[PDB]
C-alpha cells in the first residue's frame, strides 16, 4: 500500500467486504485494504475489532498503538509474513559511526544556526554573531562543546542572564513540555519508519530511550523557545495553551509552507533513507 492511515479522533473500525470501515461521529469513511500501508492509532479512545486485526495480519499492514501521551507503546507482531520494517531495522543496526557523526554534526549545526537566526530576528547582533561563530566553529567529535556554549548564550539572551535551565520555574517546565510534544511527534515519526528509537545518533549517552528522536527533534527546538519567550510572563497553564497551538500553526519548510506533521515526516524519512544509503542528502530545516 501507499497511504498511511492515522486516527487522531474517537472512532470505531470494522472490516466488511475487503473494505475497512472507519466510523466517526462526524462522518463515515470506507477505505480499500490494498490502498492502506501503515496504520497508527494516536489516542486511547479508538475502538477496533479482532477481525480487522486478522485482515491486517493477512494484509501485512503495521499496526501502531499509542498511549494518552501519544508516545508509541506497542506494535502488532505477526508470526508469519512479517513487515519490511523489521527487515529495515537490521540496517539501523548496521549504521556506521561516520554517518552517525555526520548526521549528528549536521543536526547540531542546524539547531545552532536556528538559534542564532532567531536571535537575529530578536535583534541581538552580538549574541547571534557569537552563536553563529560557534556554528562555524563546530567540528566532529565535539571537542569544543560549542553547542553547550551556545546554549547559555541563547537562553541568557532570551530570558535574561539570571535564567538557567537547571533552575525550577514555569519557563523550564514549559521548555520541557514543548520538548515533550516535539519528542512525541518525532518519536511517532521514527516509529513509523520502524527504526528502534533506543539506538541514538549521539554516541556518548545511551541513557535516554528516545535518543534517536531526541536527536532528530533538535533543529526544531528553538520554535518552542520563541513562543516560550513571548509568553514567559504568563502562567504555566497559559504557556501550555500557547504551545498547544503549534499543531494548528503552519511553518515554512524549505520547499513550501507546510504543517509541522508533514515537515517532521519528510525530515524523518530523509534522515532514515540517508542513514541507510550512507549520506545521500541531509535534510536541512531553517526557521
Amino acid at each position: 500500500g501507499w497511504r498511511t492511515v492515522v486516527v487522531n479522533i474517537h472512532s470505531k473500525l470494522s472490516y466488511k467486504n475487503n473494505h475497512l470501515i472507519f466510523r466517526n461521529s462526524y462522518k463515515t469513511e470506507m477505505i480499500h485494504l490494498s490502498e492502506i500501508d501503515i496504520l497508527l492509532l494516536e489516542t486511547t479512545d479508538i475502538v477496533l475489532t479482532t477481525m480487522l486485526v486478522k485482515r491486517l495480519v493477512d494484509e501485512n499492514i503495521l499496526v501502531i498503538f499509542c498511549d494518552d501521551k501519544r508516545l508509541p507503546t506497542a506494535f502488532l507482531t505477526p508470526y508469519y509474513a512479517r513487515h519490511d520494517s523489521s527487515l529495515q531495522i537490521a540496517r539501523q543496526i548496521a549504521w556506521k559511526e561516520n554517518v552517525k557523526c555526520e548526521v549528528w554534526t549536521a543536526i547540531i549545526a542546524q539547531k545552532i544556526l536556528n538559534q542564532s537566526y532567531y536571535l537575529g530576528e530578536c535583534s541581538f547582533f552580538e549574541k547571534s554573531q557569537s552563536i553563529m561563530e560557534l556554528y562555524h566553529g563546530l567540528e566532529r567529535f565535539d571537542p569544543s562543546n560549542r553547542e553547550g556554549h551556545s546554549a547559555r548564550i541563547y537562553f541568557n539572551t532570551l530570558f535574561g542572564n539570571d535564567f538557567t535551565r537547571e533552575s525550577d520555574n514555569d519557563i523550564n517546565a514549559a521548555l520541557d513540555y514543548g520538548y515533550t510534544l516535539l519528542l512525541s511527534m518525532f518519536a511517532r515519526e521514527v516509529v513509523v519508519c520502524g527504526c528502534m528509537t533506543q539506538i541514538g545518533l549521539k554516541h556518548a549517552n545511551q541513557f535516554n530511550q528516545f535518543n534517536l528522536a531526541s536527536d532528530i527533534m533538535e533543529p526544531f527546538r528553538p520554535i518552542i523557545d520563541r513562543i516560550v519567550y513571548q509568553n514567559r510572563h504568563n502562567n504555566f497553564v497559559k504557556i501550555k495553551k500557547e504551545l498547544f497551538s503549534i499543531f494548528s500553526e503552519t511553518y515554512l519548510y524549505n520547499g513550501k509552507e507546510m504543517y509541522l506533521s508533514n515537515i517532521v515526516s519528510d525530515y524523518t524519512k530523509k534522515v532514515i533513507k540517508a542513514l541507510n544509503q550512507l549520506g545521500e542528502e541531509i535534510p536541512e530545516f531553517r526557521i
Partner: protein, 96 residues
C-alpha cells in the same frame, strides 16, 4: 430580498471541519437552504432583517471562513438555474 450566500474555508484540520459543521448548522437554523455545497440562499423580509442577518453572519463566521453575499430579486432568485453534470478521441471503456 433574496440573499445568495457562498461559504468556503480550509477544511484540512479537524477543528476546521468542526467549525464548518457548526457554521452550516447555524445557517440551517437561520432559515438558509443549501442548494449545493457552499451554495445557500435565504429569503429576507426587508432591508432591516437583511442588515441584522449580515451582522449575525459576520459574528458567526468561523476562523479562516469566507462568505460571499449577493442580493437578488425574488423573481431573479427563482431564475436561479442549477446545472449538474469538444474532444477528438472519445473513449468508452477503460481509460488506459
Amino acid at each position: 430580498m433574496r440573499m445568495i450566500l457562498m461559504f468556503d474555508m480550509p477544511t484540512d484540520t479537524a477543528e476546521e471541519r468542526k467549525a464548518y459543521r457548526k457554521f452550516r448548522k447555524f445557517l440551517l437554523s437561520e432559515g438558509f437552504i443549501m442548494h449545493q455545497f457552499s451554495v445557500y440562499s435565504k429569503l429576507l423580509l426587508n432591508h432591516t432583517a437583511n442588515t441584522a442577518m449580515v451582522g449575525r453572519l459576520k459574528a458567526n463566521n468561523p476562523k479562516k471562513g469566507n462568505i460571499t453575499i449577493l442580493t437578488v430579486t425574488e423573481k431573479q432568485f427563482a431564475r436561479m438555474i442549477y446545472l449538474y453534470g469538444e474532444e477528438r478521441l472519445v473513449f468508452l471503456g477503460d481509460n488506459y
